[PDB]
C-alpha cells in the first residue's frame, strides 16, 4: 500500500518515561516533550503547516501508564525481553575535507527503548550540537533512534559511537574516519 | 534490570488517495500484540489470551465501538487531509557526486526524498554494480551508495544517471578514465 500514518505511544516502568510521536512513511512528523509539555516538530517548518495541543498526548500517556500497571498485575510481573540493537555510523552528505557534515549513528531493531549513547572523538567523549531523534516505531514493535554529531572532515581524526544498552554483555562501538 | 513496556500504535494505511483507508489500533505489552481493532474486521480481536477480557469488554462498549468503526473518517481521512497540505507530496532532489573507493567507482546520491529512485551506471551495464539500498538519514532524506567495479580503460567515460520524481529532468555525473 501507498502511505502510512502511525501515532506511536509507549510507557515503561520503573524508568517512568513516556514517548508520544506521529510517524509518516517511516520518518517522524513531530513528538510531545513530557518535561516541556510542548509539540516538537521534527523539522521546524512543519509548525507552519499544522498544530497539535500537547495536553491530549499527556492525557493519553497517563492512560497508557494505568494500563501498564494493570497488564503487569495480570501478567504476573513477567519482564520485557531485552533485544539488543544493530548499529551503523555513516556521513550525512558525501565527505569533502574542511566542509561541515553530520555523522549519523543509527541504532536499529532493539528493545526496550532505553539507550546510553556516547559520541567519541579520537577516544575523547564529545558533545557539541549533538542531537537525537525520539525512539522510532517498527512493525515488529522493536525500535530505532538516530544520533547526529555535527563535525568537520579531518583525515587524521577517528569518531566512535558507543551504546550501553543492557541487552549487551559489553558496549557496542562502531568507528568511522576519512 | 527488570523493565516493563507498553506500546499503543494507531495505524492509518492509505492507497490510491483516500479511497482505500485501513485503521489499525494495536495494544502491545512487552513487544507482543495482545488486542487489535482493525477497520476491515469491524471489532476488537484478542490475539493472545491476555486480550479476551478487554476485547470482550470493548466490543460490549457500544459507544466506543462506533468511535473505532468511524476512525477511518474522523481520524485517518482528517489527519491525511492535513498531511496532503505539506508532507504527502514533499520532494527534495538529491546531491549526486562520484569518486573512487578505499578500480571501483562510487556514485553517492544524497539528500533525496521521497525514497523511490532509479540510479544506474553506463560505459556510454548490469554486472559489477553493488548498492547499499535505500538508507533513512532520519531528517526526511535518503542516501544510496551505488558503486561499480571498472578496469581503468584509457579515455573511456563512466556516467552515473539518477531519475528521481524531485525534478522530471534526470541528474547525470561523469568520470573519465
Amino acid at each position: 500500500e501507498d502511505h502510512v500514518i502511525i501515532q506511536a505511544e509507549f510507557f515503561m516502568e520503573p524508568d517512568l518515561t513516556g514517548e508520544f510521536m506521529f510517524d509518516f512513511d517511516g520518518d517522524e512528523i513531530f513528538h510531545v516533550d513530557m518535561q516541556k509539555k510542548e509539540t516538537v516538530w521534527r523539522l521546524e517548518e512543519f509548525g507552519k503547516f499544522a498544530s497539535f495541543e500537547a495536553q491530549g498526548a499527556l492525557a493519553n500517556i497517563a492512560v497508557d501508564k494505568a494500563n501498564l500497571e494493570t497488564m503487569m498485575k495480570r501478567s504476573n510481573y513477567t519482564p520485557n525481553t531485552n533485544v539488543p540493537p544493530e548499529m551503523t555510523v555513516f556521513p550525512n552528505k558525501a565527505v569533502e575535507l574542511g566542509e561541515p557534515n553530520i555523522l549519523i549513528c543509527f541504532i536499529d531493531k532493539f528493545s526496550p527503548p532505553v539507550l546510553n549513547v556516547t559520541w567519541l572523538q579520537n577516544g575523547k567523549p564529545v558533545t557539541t550540537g549533538v542531537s537525537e531523534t525520539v525512539f522510532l516505531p517498527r512493525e515488529d514493535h522493536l525500535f530505532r533512534k538516530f544520533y547526529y554529531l555535527p563535525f568537520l572532515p579531518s583525515n587524521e581524526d577517528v569518531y566512535d559511537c558507543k551504546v550501553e544498552h543492557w541487552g549487551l554483555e559489553e558496549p557496542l562501538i562502531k568507528h568511522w574516519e576519512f | 534490570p527488570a523493565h516493563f513496556l507498553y506500546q499503543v500504535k494507531f495505524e492509518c494505511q492509505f492507497s490510491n488517495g483516500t479511497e482505500r483507508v485501513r485503521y489499525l489500533h494495536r495494544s502491545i505489552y512487552n513487544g507482543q500484540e495482545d488486542v487489535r481493532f482493525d477497520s476491515d474486521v469491524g471489532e476488537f480481536r484478542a490475539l493472545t489470551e491476555l486480550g479476551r477480557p478487554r476485547a470482550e469488554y470493548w466490543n460490549s462498549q457500544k459507544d466506543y465501538l462506533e468511535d473505532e468503526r468511524a476512525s477511518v473518517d474522523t481520524y485517518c481521512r482528517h489527519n491525511y487531509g492535513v498531511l496532503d497540505g505539506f508532507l504527502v507530496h514533499r520532494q527534495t532532489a538529491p546531491t549526486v557526486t562520484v569518486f573512487p573507493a578505499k578500480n571501483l567507482l562510487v556514485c553517492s546520491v544524497n539528500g533525496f526524498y521521497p525514497g523511490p529512485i532509479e540510479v544506474r551506471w553506463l560505459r556510454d551495464e548490469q554486472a559489477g554494480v553493488v548498492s547499499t539500498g535505500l538508507i533513512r538519514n532520519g531528517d526526511w532524506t535518503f542516501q544510496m551508495l551505488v558503486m561499480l567495479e571498472t578496469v581503468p580503460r584509457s579515455g573511456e567515460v563512466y556516467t552515473c544517471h539518477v531519475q528521481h520524481p524531485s525534478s522530471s529532468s534526470p541528474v547525470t555525473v561523469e568520470w573519465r578514465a
Binding site: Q7, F22, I29, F49, A50, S51, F52, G56, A57, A59, N60, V63, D64, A66, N67, T70 | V8, F10, H25, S27, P53, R54, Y57, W58, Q61, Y64, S71, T74, Y75, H78, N79, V82, G85
Partner: peptide
C-alpha cells in the same frame, strides 16, 4: 490545520 488523536480507555 490541526492533527487529531485517538485515545484508549482503561481496564478495571
Amino acid at each position: 490545520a490541526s492533527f487529531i488523536i485517538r485515545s484508549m480507555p482503561q481496564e478495571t
